[PDB]
Structures are given as C-alpha cells and as structure tokens.
C-alpha cells in the first residue's frame, strides 16, 4: 500500500547518469509530504504539476529516475536544455510534467583520493531522445579507420569518470538527483484520502 519512495531517495548507492535507474511505482498509496516538507533538498523544480497538491491526485504510474551528476550539471536536468549530460546521458522532454529533485551528496559519494565509480557519457554522434538510456561501452570511432574495440588514435572510450573529491568546489561536488515523472486508463497510484 505504501509507495517505495524511500527505496529511491534514501538508497545507499545511486547509479551513474549514463546508466540511470528508473523505478516503476504502481498499485500503492503515495505520501508526498515527506518530500515537499523536507529541508534537505537544494533544488525542487517542478514543471506543470504542484507537489503541494500531490496528496489529492490519482495517476496511472509514477517514475523515479535516480543518478548522480555534478553541481554545474544540475541545471541541465530541465526541459529544453543542452550539454554533455542533457544530450548524451539523460534528456528531459520539452513537454515534461514532473519534478526535478537534487541534493548535495558530498558526504556519501565523494571519497578521499576520489570516487572514480560514477561515470558519464562523453562521446556520442547524436543527442539522446527524451527518456532514453544508452549503456553502450563500444569504442567511439572519431575517424574513418575502424577501431576494433581498442583505444587509440581517433578511438576514445565513450565514458569518463567524475572523480568526486571532498576538497572540490561546490559545483564539482556530487549531487544525487531524483526525477519524478507522472503519467496519467485505471489509476493505480493515488495520494492519501
């Protein structure tokens, strides 16, 4: 009956942005006061929906997208935005209806001497379509000569490491991001009363 929002927000480890996880929430009662009454979030941008009224709505499904990015890249998680994260890792539709929630996670995700486990896609010949996940690790062919799956000249690994460190500036520090997508057919997800 209780929607597993805690498993998403309070997760011990988040996924890399290139392989962002999506949680399907269905057939449960969702309490959102835990979210919008909180004081832990640095960003709670909502587009087209009112979070303070979320306890009086019925949807077909709710999606929870989780990943970790830098502080400077949080601005890219918004409709009609461009950048390495927005174009190659996680893209929001221009008609996006939902909330983008982010909070600083330097305590949990930045290690002394760096983390090197959170990754992002650096090379891609075309921008991602909205809500598309690309987990390919094929060597990026920057020239005409084939790469044969070995790094070299005009042959780059598509993924790069964030390397979060505690001593970095606020923009460089890791930020856990949860993107709430509301889909509205029978209504399986509703708030209290």
């Amino acid at each position: 009956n209780l929607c597993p929002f805690g498993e998403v927000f309070n997760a011990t480890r988040f996924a890399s942005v290139y392989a962002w996880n999506r949680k399907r929430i269905s057939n449960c009662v969702a309490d959102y006061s835990v979210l919008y009454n909180s004081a832990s979030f640095s960003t709670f941008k909502c587009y087209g929906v009112s979070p303070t009224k979320l306890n009086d709505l019925c949807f077909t499904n709710v999606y929870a997208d989780s990943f970790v990015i830098r502080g400077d890249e949080v601005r890219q998680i918004a409709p009609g935005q461009t950048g390495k994260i927005a174009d190659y890792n996680y893209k929001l539709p221009d008609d996006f209806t939902g909330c983008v929630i982010a909070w600083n996670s330097n305590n949990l995700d930045s290690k002394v001497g760096g983390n090197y486990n959170y990754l992002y896609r650096l090379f891609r010949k075309s921008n991602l379509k909205p809500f598309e996940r690309d987990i390919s690790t094929e060597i990026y062919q920057a020239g005409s000569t084939p790469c044969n799956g070995v790094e070299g000249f005009n042959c780059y690994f598509p993924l790069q490491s964030y390397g979060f460190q505690p001593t970095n500036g606020v923009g460089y520090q890791p930020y856990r991001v949860v993107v709430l997508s509301f889909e509205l057919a029978p209504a399986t997800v509703c708030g209290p009363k």
Partner: antibody, heavy 117, light 108 residues
Framework: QVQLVESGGGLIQPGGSLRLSCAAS????????MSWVRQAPGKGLEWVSV???????FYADSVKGRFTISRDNSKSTLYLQMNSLRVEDTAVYYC???????????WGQGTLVTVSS | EIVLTQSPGTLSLSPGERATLSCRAS??????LAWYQQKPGQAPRLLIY???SRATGIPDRFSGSGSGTDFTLTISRLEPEDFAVYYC?????????FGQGTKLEIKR
C-alpha cells in the same frame, strides 16, 4: 596525420560580417568536439565557441548573440560566422580540435581578423 | 569566471638547466589543467593534458605536477628548440580560461 587549415581572415569595418573557414583532415568533423580560440595582439588566448559531436553549440559571453559556429560534413570544414563585429574583436582566431570540451590537442595555423574603419 | 596566474611572467635560463613554471588558479580545478607551447609565428602545441599526463610526441623531459590551485610545469634538458611562450589552461568549470603566458628565453 592531422591537418587544420584556416581561411577568411581580413579587414572588415565595425558592424560588418565575416566568416572563417577551417578545413580538417585526419579525423571526422561530425564526430568530434571543435572550438574556435582567438588571441588578441599581446593579450593571450581566449575561448570563443565550441560545437559538440552531437551538434550542440556554446559560445562565450563576449561573442554570444553575434558569433555562430557550424560545421559542413560534406566539405570537412568548420565555420565561424561573425556578425556585428567590433573593433575589440580584432584578434588571431585559431581553429582547434577539442577533446570532449576539455583541451585542444590539435591547432590550426590561425588567421588574422582586423576590424577597423 | 576563473583566473589563472602564471609565474614567472618571463624567464631566461641557459641551455641544459631546469625551467620551473608555476600556474595558480582562482578556484581549485582538481587537476583539470592543460599546458601548451607556442613558438613565434606558430600555433599553440599541446604538451601536457591533465595535471601530469604527457601528450603524444613530446619528450619525457616535459613534466606536469600539482593539483587543486597550484600547478607546475618542469622542463628538464633545456634544448634550443625550446624557449617559446607557455600557457596553462583549465577545464574544470566553464568557460575555459588560459593563463597570461610565460615567455622562455635562452641565455648566452
């Protein structure tokens, strides 16, 4: 081998328009980040614009709204349109191959743009 | 905007010595620095990417060091083919910025 040859530099009155061409060899233009970097006489290097492998374009504050960066895959050339030029825009504009919006591993010989009445 | 300051502004050492060039930044960039060498009438050439990684085709005598706000370029075995202007560029935060340069002069 990698080659970057530039063209289009010259004299232009303030408020005029000028386009800079940069033919590229040794790599695929469409699949790489590429940037224009200008160097005013005795001032040093300054980043101007970048075009991503996916086609996204970003510009500097001093040139935003006036400069337009573009690529022609059919002709393997990187372009830089310079509308509403100013006297302070006078610099030597370099054509550089960008490694993922981080650093410029290959540079063109550079072309000189002089803006004066 | 982040400002990179190179010290010294100019430097003149005899061939065969060690040239030490500093490069300090406004904020910490976490080793996201690059070193370039520009000979007169020529384009800049990439020497070192990252704080310490050496670009292809550059001799081992060129070495990068430092992290955060302090970086160092050390050129050992100074040969007359050297002695150009050296810039350092950061790429930790947009927009990318360069240093004012450090002219390298030969002494005779």
């Amino acid at each position: 081998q990698v080659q970057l040859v530039e063209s289009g530099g010259g004299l232009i009155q303030p408020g005029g328009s000028l386009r800079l061409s940069c033919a590229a060899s040794g790599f695929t233009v469409s699949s790489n980040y590429m940037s224009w970097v200008r160097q005013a006489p005795g001032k040093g290097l300054e980043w101007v614009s970048v075009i991503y492998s996916g086609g996204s374009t970003f510009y500097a504050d001093s040139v935003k709204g006036r400069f337009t960066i573009s690529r022609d895959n059919s002709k393997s050339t990187l372009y830089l349109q310079m509308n509403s030029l100013r006297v302070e825009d006078t610099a030597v504009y370099y054509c550089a191959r960008d490694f993922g919006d981080f650093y410029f591993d290959y540079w063109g010989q550079g072309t000189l743009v002089t803006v004066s009445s | 905007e982040i400002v990179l300051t190179q010290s010294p502004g100019t430097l003149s050492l005899s061939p065969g010595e060690r040239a030490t060039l500093s490069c300090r930044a406004s904020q910490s960039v976490s080793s996201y620095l690059a070193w370039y060498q520009q000979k007169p009438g020529q384009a800049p050439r990439l020497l070192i990417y990252g704080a310490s990684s050496r670009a292809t085709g550059i001799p081992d005598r060129f070495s990068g060091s430092g992290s955060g706000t302090d970086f160092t370029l050390t050129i050992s075995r100074l040969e007359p083919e050297d002695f150009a202007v050296y810039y350092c560029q950061q790429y930790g935060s947009s927009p990318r910025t360069f240093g004012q340069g450090t002219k390298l002069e030969i002494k005779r």
